[PDB]
Hints:
By secondary structure, this protein is α/β, with parallel strands linked by helices. The protein has 3 domains: 1-102 and 173-476, Glycosidases (TIM Barrel), CATH 3.20.20.80; 103-172, Alpha-Beta Complex (Oligo-1,6-glucosidase, domain 2); 477-554, Golgi alpha-mannosidase II (Immunoglobulin-like, Sandwich), CATH 2.60.40. The chain has helices spanning 3-6, 28-33, 35-41, 76-88, 107-112, 173-187, 213-217, 219-222, 229-239, 261-264, 296-310, 328-332, 340-351, 382-392, 399-409, 446-450, 456-469, 472-475, and strands at 9-12, 45-48, 52-53, 65-69, 92-97, 126-127, 147-150, 155-158, 193-196, 247-251, 273-275, 317-318, 357-361, 477-480, 488-495, 498-505, 511-514, 521-528, 540-543, 548-553. It has an 8-stranded parallel β-sheet with strand order 11-10-9-5-2-1-13-12. Strands 14-15-16-20-18 form a 5-stranded antiparallel β-sheet. The longest helix is centred in the N-terminal third of the chain and has 15 residues, at 173-187. Calcium ion binds next to loops. Residues 19, 21, 23, 25, 27 line the site of calcium ion (CA). Ca(2+) binds at residues 19, 21, 23, 25, 27. GO terms for molecular function: alpha-amylase activity; isomerase activity; metal ion binding. Keywords: Calcium, Glycosidase, Hydrolase, Isomerase, Metal-binding, Signal. Belongs to the glycosyl hydrolase 13 family.
Amino acid sequence: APWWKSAVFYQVYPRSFKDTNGDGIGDFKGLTEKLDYLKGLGIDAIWINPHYASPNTDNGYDISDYREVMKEYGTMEDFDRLMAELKKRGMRLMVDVVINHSSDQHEWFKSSRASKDNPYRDYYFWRDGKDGHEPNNYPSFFGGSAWEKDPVTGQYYLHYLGRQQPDLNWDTPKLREELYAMLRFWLDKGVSGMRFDTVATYSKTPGFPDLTPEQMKNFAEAYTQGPNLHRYLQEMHEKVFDHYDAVTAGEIFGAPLNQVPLFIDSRRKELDMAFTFDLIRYDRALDRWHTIPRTLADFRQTIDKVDAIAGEYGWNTFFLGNHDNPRAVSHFGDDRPQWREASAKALATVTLTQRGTPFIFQGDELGMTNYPFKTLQDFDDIEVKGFFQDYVETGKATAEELLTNVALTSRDNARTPFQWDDSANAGFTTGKPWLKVNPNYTEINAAREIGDPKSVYSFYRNLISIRHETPALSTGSYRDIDPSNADVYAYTRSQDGETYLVVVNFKAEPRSFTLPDGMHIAETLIESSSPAAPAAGAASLELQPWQSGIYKVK
Ligand SMILES: [Ca+2]
């Protein structure tokens, strides 16, 4: 089994991790200075968000030169030093790869847009408008049409994401070759992994027909149905990843779950691991800014479906948080002051006992929460400006309705600065932070958590040790004990004759749990929020509100 199947990854959003020069923005020196912190937590590998030259209309996801580092993060020597310090500690780097689209400030795009006849014209998608308007009805994730007119040629260019993020044209062989050369530039430096942003949208539909009214309400899914998608992923593997030893993982956003095996079945020679969004978006409405109430039965049934698509030859990541989603404890747990620590531990237990490679998002090991936004001016999020354009300016919603609802879903909840201690701005910066620090940093910070054996951080650290010592808990089979139960989540992990039971109360009330007939507790590995372990031989358990536990059975 490869190293990445048993590894524990941590995701660093460098903009918000640690600033070392007072400009309010996190940087490479900051990340490098905190490597001992991450080593001591027990992290094997870090995934960093984009670190390349960028105008930052979308905080690194609009890249203007793929072979230079972002000015705010440091220099190429700072990147090289990050790499060297990771290696000293036996840790690996995964970088973010953003090749569905570039910045409109990339030299390819400046050349492409200049005339119709130039060698870069087909690096992007340029099309004539139809019947007085855009080439078709495609919407953009970030507001308005996915087509933007350029008066120089009178044609429109495609952008699924922001106006400043034109889509790259994978149908053009010279363009594919340029992307492959660029990937080699980074892999030659020794990076150990690559995470592919919106990997399912690379192939565009020939002819760009209109979306149907059905497709229009779920456009994210129509954009994943390009006919050449797997041909491109296979060619990238053959020309690039076959020559290296790096792991690959795809952000498969918008794809129907039954198509996921095409990306990750190891026999297909495409990607190694999947990030899927069925679970993290399980309670999101189609418009992406409302929430729909769900129960633990929905949570566990979604997991069971995602596990089944990995089958025998594929592999899943597991995550409860990332830079595009609200905080795990607020979203899946209960972030009220009395339940925040109990429920954040319960979610740690879930995260670290799933079948797949877990990714811990920066700050979740502290039990960091959603941010108390007060006005729409408190959001940096360009996705929020897009909802304002699509919903407030059009009269569909008031500003107060947008505010109330996006406060719960906005990705800026995940982007507030990491809370290091209780000094000014939580020790993130000596200057003014680019996004405000959550005021609860006085109660939620790394310095106070590390020093307390009973903290959320200590629980994460202890779980990571246990997982490392117990192979069933990464590579073992997974079986949900009762998918209909909406109160208590329970499942087994087994490998090579060893079976482990995981039991997690999702109610803020006491609950009982009866083990399957014949199964008995043999040993308790760890519990959260419990006054007493069960007795060896127990056929049932009494659970405190939000209690979690791992037990060896038989
Ligand atoms: Ca800085």
